Amino acid sequence: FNTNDETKRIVWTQTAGHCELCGTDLTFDYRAGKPMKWGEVAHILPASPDTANLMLLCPGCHDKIDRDADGYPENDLSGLHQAYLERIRLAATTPDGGRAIPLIVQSQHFQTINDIPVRDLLTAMSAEGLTAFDQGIKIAFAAPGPRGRDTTYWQNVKDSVQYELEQQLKRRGGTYGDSPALAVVGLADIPALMMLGQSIGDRSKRLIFSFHREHLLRWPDQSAEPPSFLFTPPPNGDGPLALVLSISAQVPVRDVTDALPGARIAELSIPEPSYAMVQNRRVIHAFRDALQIRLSQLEALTPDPIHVFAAIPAALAIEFGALLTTQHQHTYLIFDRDKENQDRFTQTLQLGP
C-alpha cells in the first residue's frame, strides 16, 4: 500500500532503518556511497489486516507476506511489530539511564594536600555516559574526637554518609523511576575508605572512580587487562592470622610482625606492585573477585579474626569495604600506619560481629 513522503520519514525513524522481520540495515546503500532510494529499498505496510501501526520491511521479507488487494497483510504482525519498536525505544532511551549522583569523599588531609573538584569527576562521569542533574556531594570525614576513631566515631561516619546518600537516591527519574547511579571517588586513609565502602555496599547501580596521579580522575587505560593476583597461603600454626595486601607496594614483613607478633602471613599481591595499577574499573572488579575467593579460603581455615595490613590504591580500599556487607560477617581487624608512632601499623578499625 502507498504512503506519502512524510509518513515514510516517521516509519524510517521509529524503526532506526532496519527491517523489522530480519534486522537488515536498510541504510546500507548510503554507507556504500550510493544514493538513498527510500521507496525502493524498503516497503511500508500496516502490521494488521496511524504511523504507530506501520512496519518497515525490506523487499525480501515484504514479498513473503500475504497481502490483500489494498496492500494490507492477511496475517496479524502487530505482536512482532510492537515488540520491535519496544526494543528500539529501550535502546534509544538508554542515555537517561545514566542519571547519577557525584560523590567525592576525602579526609581533611587530602582535602588540603590534594583537593578533588567536582568538575574533575563530572568530566570523567560525562565521558562514561553518567549525567549529574544537581550539585555534586563533596564531604570530608569528621575530624576525630578525644576518644579517637572508636566505634561511635565510625558509626557516625556511616550514618552521615548513608544519610546524604539515601536523600539523593530519592531523586528517582528517567524512563522507569529508577534511583540514580552513585558515582563515587575516595581519597582518604585506608580505614576511612573501607568505611565508605561499608556505607555504599555493592548491590546497587554504583560506579567507583579513581584519582590517578598522572591522569587524575580519567582512567589511564581502558584497554589494559587486570593483573594476575598472586596468593601466598599462610603457614600452618597458631599465631594470629594476618592478611597482607601488597598491591600499591610490597608490605615489609617486619612491619607486620612488629605490630602483630607471631603473625602467620597470607599475602595477596600483583606481579609488579605499583601506585598506578588502577588502569581501569575492571582492575577494581578483578581485585574484589580474587580477594573474596581467598577470604573464603582463609575463613574456612579459622574462626578467628583476620588482621589486615594493606598497601592498596584508594579505589581498591573502598571495594574491599563494600565486599564485606553481606549478611554473613567475619571479624576483620584493619591496621594502618600511625604517622604519630613512626609509621607503625596499629589497629584502627573493626568490621564484623
Ligand X SMILES: Nc1ncnc2c1ncn2[C@@H]1O[C@@H]2COP(=O)(O)O[C@@H]3[C@H](O)[C@@H](COP(=O)(O)O[C@H]2[C@H]1O)O[C@H]3n1cnc2c(N)ncnc21
Q: After which residues is the chain broken (C to N over 2.5 A)?
A: 49
Query: Of these partners, ligand X, Zn ion, Mg ion, none, which one is at the site of residue 163 (CB under 5 to 8 Å by kind)?
Result: none
Write the interaction track for a second copy spanning residues 174-193; mark x where CB under 8 A is met and - where it is not: xxxxxx-------x-x----
Its sign, for the CA torsion 118, 286, 337, 273, is: negative
**Considering only residues 21, 165, 310, 317, which one is a binding residue for Zn ion as defined by CB under 5 A?**
21
Choose among 287, 279, 295, 286: nearest CA to 329.
295
Sites for Zn ion among residues 38-67 (CB under 5 A):
58, 61
**258 annotated as ligand-binding:** no
Q: How far apart are CA 106 and CA 318, in angstroms?
A: 12
Taking CB under 8 A as the rule, does residue 6 contact a second copy?
Answer: yes
* 96 annotated to a ligand binding site: no
The smaller minimum CB distance to ligand X, of residues 170 and 203, is found at 203
Q: How far is the CB of 150 from a second copy (least distance, A)?
A: 9
Binding site for ligand X (CB under 6 A): 114, 187, 189-190, 202-203, 211, 213, 248-249, 251, 275, 311-314, 317, 326-328, 337
# chain residues binding Zn ion, by CB under 5 A: 5
C-alpha 327, offset from chain centre: 22
Could you tell which of ligand X, Mg ion, a second copy, none binds residue 228, using a CB distance below 5 to 8 A set by kind?
Answer: none
Partner interacting with residue 42 (select from Zn ion, Mg ion, a second copy, none; CB below 5-8 Å by kind): Mg ion
Task: Please give the Cα distance from 244 to 250 (Å, whole number).
Answer: 9
Q: Which is nearer to ligand X, 170 or 328 (CB)?
A: 328
Identify the three-state secondary structure at position 154: helix
119 makes contact, choosing from a second copy, Zn ion, Mg ion, none, with CB < 5 to 8 Å by partner type, with a second copy
CA angle 118, 186, 304 (to 5 degrees): 165
Scanning the chain, the segments in alpha helix (DSSP H) are 5-14, 28-31, 38-41, 59-63, 78-92, 108-113, 118-127, 151-169, 190-200, 253-259, 281-301, 314-323
Binding mask 78-117 toward a second copy (x if CB under 8 A, else -) reads -xx-xxx-xxxxxxxxxxxx-x---------xxxxxxx-x
Closest contact distance (angstroms) between CB of 251 and ligand X is: 5
Kindly tell me which of 190 and 241 has the beta carbon lying closer to ligand X. Answer: 190
Nearest residue to 227 via CA among 313, 121, 323: 313
Helix, strand, coil shares of the chain, percent, nearest 5, are 35, 20, 40
- Of the pair 52, 249, the CB lying nearest Mg ion is at 52
The helix (run of H) or strand (run of E) holding residue 110 is helix 108-113
Partner interacting with residue 89 (select from ligand X, Mg ion, a second copy, none; CB below 5-8 Å by kind): a second copy
Contact 329, 201 (CB under 8 A): no
